Symmetry: D2
Subunit: 244 residues, 4 copies
């Protein structure tokens, strides 16, 4: 059975991705930072379905002097548990505003650029170095070119992740590793404010769900996507096409 | 009952593979063709051997003219006549040849812009008016790094990106999704010399080979599926990384 | 010897401002027009009062048809007959109106795709065949966030992006640069209610106002200048940030 | 009163051409540099010979670190100290070298992402906070979506710079600060690159089969800071001779 690493897998979109990969027959590494109880509860659910098919792995993905070692350990945890690592899903992400005009700003850089871009880069390095249907899926943002007001560092990090997706697709193609993205628009919100976000969506008659994001990940890691690399699939209900 | 799909230019090559995979997924299919009558009828015969009364052919020229709206309405009508419904439209048919800046030029406009853009637009209109509904447009992953001396073809494929996005927005309230699949190098021309085919294959980072028709069809199957119900206005490159390679 | 420029749709609004600024920069100008004869002639008379024998008018319909290639050849020929050279082509003329998916539709195709894409292509062909040479195409900064029910217009503007890029590549060996200027909200219709105009103006981050025609013309002047001699295939948005604003 | 500009990495090459053309347009200039002190001082001397007290140098490392915010604040402060105003910021300084996926990697992150993205962000913050024709120009890369093999961190940094350009254009528009980019394709090749390798790059360019001069890049910066660009914000102008349009 193939094996996958999902970062930020305890809750929300990462959890849905881990569940759908497991349902597809993958063994999974459930990475978490703060959500140990939720990570272990997910692993317990998946292991009840198929014994010894889910493990957890703790790591802070903030940039620091130790982040490279932390990322090498996440990949190593998959090889140790399952003897292989076929899929990496870079899902974990910090998200909060960083206004240009008025945590230290350098802590915000470490968290926003680290989680959304540098950790994906280091995980990609470790995944490739440790190596079939191998692939990486990066969780992008469908609104990357129509950014949220006062979200500069977040937007910079998601732009950097587009660059990584494309750069790594090119560089890792000779190794047979595909590198793609899934770009949610409005997916799971953290009622009046939620409804303001919902109302913009052309396909809004249909509820946005973590499972719809996971469905695009399942396609990209499947044999039905064996010629697809460097592609970012928007899963946004049309939101990115709506003008101001 | 079984859903129904129209595939334009479905007698051969990528359109044929799309029609076959939709049929294997449980669709009834209208095999549109222009000149390839024998191949269209042979495909319909093969699919009907698998499941009786699940495939028909429909002939039409998709060159632009004052009758193209009637032709496109008739293709959609042929799906309703055969199957009583029309759930999926795949705009695959396409003229492709150079038009250097330095057949009459108006015939070249009619063929290249008609097949790649205006016929998709009119088919989209007729599909929407006659109503998991979706449209898939066959785009081009190289639309922003165009082939030398292919201006009109490239204009047509750019127009098709615009249609995909415009129609996704406008047809969302009707529950019709509109997406694209953008091949890079897929099936090369039968007439192309082996050395020239190999020059194209060597461009592709992922495996130094062209996409099979079936690999292109796999992306179409995903976009029409229940696994894509929140996806509209998206164009999936199926290009092996070709579009990311610099000069 | 003074250089010469053709500006399509130059009688009014943005095209007029482009023709005026080119004239102020030292160009002789062909003022193309379709229906606005009085305004075209008034502009020519103003420019010739400033400098004798520096402006002519040229009437043509730029709707697609069997005669459009000849019409476009004649517009370019009018510049050579008046001024002995043609250094700059500005493709500004444009039909703009909704075409809902749910005039005949083929007339709408001919007008919207003809003015926005096919006439630019044929004018580009004629300009290149007759040869700091450059072409500037008037694009649309909102081409990837289109207006509801404007599919044919949006298809035409997407095709014009493709032409800009294709022609930049193909004409580079001849030293002809091909670029675009993409307004967001510029001049609104006089008859549009101020309440509706203000809805458009409030969308614009930079000053909550539309671009003047002169601000659009400033980008054209840059692109045809010596300060842009390495720039080809580029589309400059002149949109006050509009295209960056989410729904 | 003459306006004033900061140009990062301005001792040599494209940054020097930008500083020179801004100075010729009537700006007073801060020539920021990191290691190229002799070149920076030679340039400042030449500009001050043309017009007294119109050029100063400012040294700073733009690698990311916990002091980078203070360094970036000090570069903007140096323009106010010399000239009493700061009208234009040009983010030109840039580290560029390969980082294969298969110096410590954290140093490479700090240099490549710091110079190309984080320093521009912090300089943008300081420029806005310290505040008419105000604008910022970021030196981008026309090949950002067709990246060089094994340049992932550099490419990530330049993609982040596109995001900053767009984000800052939106957020600073209410303050009348425009934020735009210039995206070279092939411009000045490295001093150390062999001629045969330079010619491989030159032969890629449709328009003239040659690299952009430093002055051609500077011309696009001068347009974007001028009154002829007063409605332009969030735009990235490719100055690439068609390079980005060429398929594999
Ligand atoms: N939700 C949306 O509408 C939306 C829209 C656009 C894009 N996306 C993208 O889709 C992906 C998933 O979105 P989501 O809303 O499910 O994400 P989320 O809930 O905001 O974050 C997912 C997980 O990221 C992990 N994470 C955060 N900071 C971390 C750090 N410093 N170190 C390690 N892990 C850290 C957290 O793990 P722990 O809980 O274990 O600490 C968290 O549960 C993200 O990449 C997001 O940017 C989502
Ligand atoms: N092959 C590639 O490498 C590649 C690369 C990029 C994009 N694509 C796109 O993928 C799609 C399929 O490619 P393909 O290579 O399989 O296409 P193709 O063989 O060139 O053409 C497909 C069919 O289009 C039909 N067609 C042509 N002109 C027509 C007209 N005037 N009226 C009606 N139908 C007409 C023909 O039908 P009849 O045979 O019945 O006359 C033909 O069999 C096209 O949209 C193409 O642009 C392909
Ligand atoms: N205004 C904006 O906010 C805006 C926004 C985005 C893009 N743009 C683009 O900028 C350019 C100028 O905009 P504008 O608002 O000044 O344009 P406009 O007033 O709508 O049209 C310019 C001229 O196009 C000519 N034209 C229309 N149909 C024609 C046909 N069938 N044959 C020949 N010429 C025809 C007309 O000439 P006659 O009057 O002589 O008949 C008209 O005066 C256009 O390309 C437009 O798409 C403008
Ligand atoms: N040349 C091209 O073909 C090309 C192509 C695409 C994009 N661009 C972009 O255009 C801009 C100018 O290119 P260029 O070739 O002239 O650049 P460059 O010579 O490679 O670098 C410009 C300056 O950046 C400074 N710099 C490097 N690391 C630094 C650090 N840690 N801290 C502070 N400053 C640092 C250096 O200053 P010191 O010398 O004082 O140490 C250097 O002189 C860059 O943003 C580049 O990415 C250039
Ligand atoms: N702050 C807000 O007000 C806010 C909260 C959630 C928002 N979401 C709508 C989509 C924005 O991209 C949902 C959303 C939720 N959680 C998220 N978590 C990550 N890591 N990244 C995202 N993009 C994300 N997004 C938007 C704004
Ligand atoms: C008689 O020959 C002709 O009229 C010309 C046909 C095109 N041509 C070429 O050299 C050529 C052929 C196939 C090429 N392919 C690589 C991908 C290009 O997009 C394969 C490919 C195959 N068939 C195709 N059919 C569509 N409708 N559209 C595509 N894009 C297409 N492409 C590229 C260039 C000159 C000869
Ligand atoms: C024929 O029926 C009509 O009069 C319709 C015209 C369009 N219309 C609008 O509501 C409308 C008009 C102008 C609008 N502008 C804002 C920018 C939109 O791109 C101004 C603007 C102005 N004239 C324009 N002319 C070109 N050729 N192209 C542009 N894009 C154009 N645009 C927007 C919507 C419905 C009425
Ligand atoms: C000497 O060892 C190194 O540091 C490496 C430098 C990069 N390198 C290359 O092969 C190389 C060098 C210059 C190249 N240029 C063509 C445009 C690439 O974008 C010229 C160009 C010039 N200097 C540059 N400086 C910035 N800061 N950024 C740009 N992009 C840059 N580019 C391309 C590839 C390997 C050796």
């Amino acid at each position: 059975a193939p094996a996958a690493v999902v970062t930020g897998a305890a809750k929300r979109i990462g959890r849905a991705i881990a569940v759908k990969l497991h349902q597809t027959g993958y063994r999974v590494v459930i990475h978490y930072h703060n959500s140990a109880e939720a990570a272990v509860s997910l692993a317990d659910e998946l292991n009840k379905e198929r014994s010894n098919t889910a493990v957890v792995c703790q790591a802070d993905l903030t940039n620091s002097n130790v982040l490279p070692a932390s990322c090498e350990e996440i990949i190593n945890s998959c090889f140790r548990a399952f003897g292989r690592c076929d899929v990496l899903v870079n899902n974990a992400s910090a998200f909060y505003p960083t206004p240009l005009v008025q945590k230290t700003v350098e802590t915000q850089v470490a968290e926003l650029i680290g989680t959304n871009a540098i950790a994906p880069f280091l995980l990609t390095m470790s995944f490739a170095q440790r190596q079939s249907n191998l692939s990486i899926v990066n969780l992008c943002d469908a609104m990357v070119d129509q950014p949220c007001m006062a979200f500069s560092l977040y937007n910079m990090g998601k732009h950097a992740l587009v660059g990584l997706t494309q750069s790594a697709a090119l560089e890792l193609a000779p190794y047979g590793i595909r590198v793609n993205g899934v770009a949610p628009g409005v997916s799971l919100l953290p009622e009046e404010e939620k409804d303001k976000w919902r109302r913009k969506v052309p396909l809004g008659r249909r509820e946005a769900s973590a499972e719809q994001i996971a469905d695009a990940v399942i396609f990209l890691v499947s044999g039905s996507a064996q010629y697809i690399t460097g592609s970012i699939i928007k899963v946004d209900g049309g939101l990115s096409l709506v003008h101001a």
